[PDB]
Amino acid sequence: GNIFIKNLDKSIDNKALYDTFSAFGNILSCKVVCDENGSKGYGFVHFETQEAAERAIEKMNGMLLNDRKVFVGRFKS
For position 68, which CATH number holds? Predict the structure, then answer.
């Protein structure tokens, strides 16, 4: 159950990403990808289950998160 999240507002850090996505399922790992300029505006969440991943896509893809609409889909780790 892995998802990508793109068009993440750059104020979203790891703890915030977890807080939002932990509603959907058991999060084993998550991260906001960063570089020397901070957040790269995308992130990944690893759910324990596939069902959780699909709930997250159903509920969050195309939805506002802070000041941007995010793109959420399945990723192969």
Answer: 3.30.70.330
- Residues followed by a break in the chain (C to N exceeding 2.5 Å) are none
Burial of 30 (0-12, 13-18, 19+ CB in 10 A): buried
Residue owning tokens 């941007």: 68
**Resolution for this PDB entry, in angstroms:** 2.0
Beta strands in the chain (DSSP E): 2-6, 27-35, 38-47, 64-65, 68-69, 71-74
In terms of residues, how long is the chain? 77
Domain ranges, residue 68: 1-77
